[PDB]
Amino acid sequence: AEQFAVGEIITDMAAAAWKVGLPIGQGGFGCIYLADMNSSESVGSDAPCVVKVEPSDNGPLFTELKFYQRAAKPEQIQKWIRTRKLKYLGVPKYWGSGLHDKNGKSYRFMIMDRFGSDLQKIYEANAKRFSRKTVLQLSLRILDILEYIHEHEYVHGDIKASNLLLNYKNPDQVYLVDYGLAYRYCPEGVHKAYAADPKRCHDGTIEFTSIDAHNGVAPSRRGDLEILGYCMIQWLTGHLPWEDNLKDPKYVRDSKIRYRENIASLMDKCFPAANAPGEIAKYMETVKLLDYTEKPLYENLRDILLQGLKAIGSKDDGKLDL
């Protein structure tokens, strides 16, 4: 069922007018089309926006839209960038949304920034490795993103390379996308209790998800940092220890628990003997110390990663080296 007539003009709830172009990408993030401001011109291949469209009863797009409306208003992000002295913040900007009826069905749409490639494609093209420099630079910016969304009451729960997109015009700026299964862990400053949430079905992506998620409890801040930990190892080494048994969640959980209890054994497993990046172990030890409701010391985690850059003779110059 086609959701749009190509070239049609759609008007959002703020009465801003947009024009719809052709589909973009290999289907990973649902029904998405290139989009631009309304004009006499057709929407081109270099369009600065995309429009996401789903049935109005689609739960994930409603969840995602609420996240973007609450936490990703352009001015709200810019104010944080200024006050925290960032070069940029990799939370996509929300440009508008509305309702669209076609063929007796109701759809919701949302206009967002258009991005370039996802990191998973680039990773695979680099024979499933990123350099230590790249991993550290990615992770510093992901820590900025996680701090910002956690301070706005949300956790992501599904950090991974396929959910990391580059700025279309700047390949040193990485953005975290896909908030359809994001979780509001602290609505109005009240932290969710250590417990399953019946409203949440999602467990994350099995190879990267947190021990909390494996235990059936709602995701919290420590879980997001743990996920990033597993991503860093995957990116550095091409592997995780539990990757041959991902059809058995009990196995995956058991391995993660054992490797949290003995982080030195994780470093021995994942890295060549005596050749483990010390910042990765220190990062994991720091995350291990977090309680379920505890606010992370994000600057301490970034300082740990910055020691890694110093150790390889570099600095945080914002260069992803992709």
Ligand X SMILES: Nc1ncc(-c2cc(F)c(O)c(F)c2)cc1-c1cc(F)c(O)c(F)c1
The binding site for Cl ion (CB under 5 A) comprises 76, 238
307 closest CA partner among 289, 273, 280, 267: 280
Q: Is 52 in the site for ligand X (CB under 6 A)?
A: yes
Q: Tell me, by CB under 6 A, how many residues bind ligand X.
A: 17
The annotation status of 116 as a binding-site residue, yes or no, is: no
* CB-nearer residue toward Cl ion: 5 or 127: 127
Span of 25-33, 93-101, 230-238, 297-305 interacting with ligand X by CB under 6 A? 25-33
Give the nearest residue (CB) to Cl ion. Answer: 238
* CB-nearer residue toward ligand X: 79 or 121: 121
CA distance 255 to 276: 19
Q: Is 29 in the site for ligand X (CB under 6 A)?
A: yes
CA distance 199 to 214: 17
158 carries an active-site annotation: yes
The annotation status of 81 as a binding-site residue, yes or no, is: no
* CB-nearer residue toward Cl ion: 37 or 81: 81
Q: Which does 238 bind (CB under 5 to 8 A by kind): Cl ion, ligand X, none?
A: Cl ion
Binding-site member from 6, 24, 81, 206 for ligand X (CB under 6 A): 24
Closest distance to Cl ion from the beta carbon of 295 (Å) = 17
The annotation status of 180 as a binding-site residue, yes or no, is: no
CA 139 to mean position of chain CA atoms: 11
Q: Which residue out of 113, 158, 178, 224 is catalytically annotated?
A: 158
Count Cα atoms within 13 angstroms, Cβ side, for 31.
15
The annotation status of 29 as a binding-site residue, yes or no, is: yes
Q: Is 113 in the site for ligand X (CB under 6 A)?
A: yes
CA 208 to mean position of chain CA atoms: 12
* CB-nearer residue toward ligand X: 28 or 278: 28
Q: Is 222 in the site for ligand X (CB under 6 A)?
A: no
The annotation status of 173 as a binding-site residue, yes or no, is: no
CB of 6 closer than 8 Å to CB of 23: no
5 closest CA partner among 81, 102, 75, 98: 102
Amino acid, single-letter form, for residue 108: R
Closest distance to ligand X from the beta carbon of 51 (Å) = 9
Residues that bind ligand X (CB under 6 A): 24-26, 28-30, 32, 50, 52, 92, 112-115, 165, 177-178
Catalytic residues: 158
Write out the binding residues for ATP.
24-32, 52
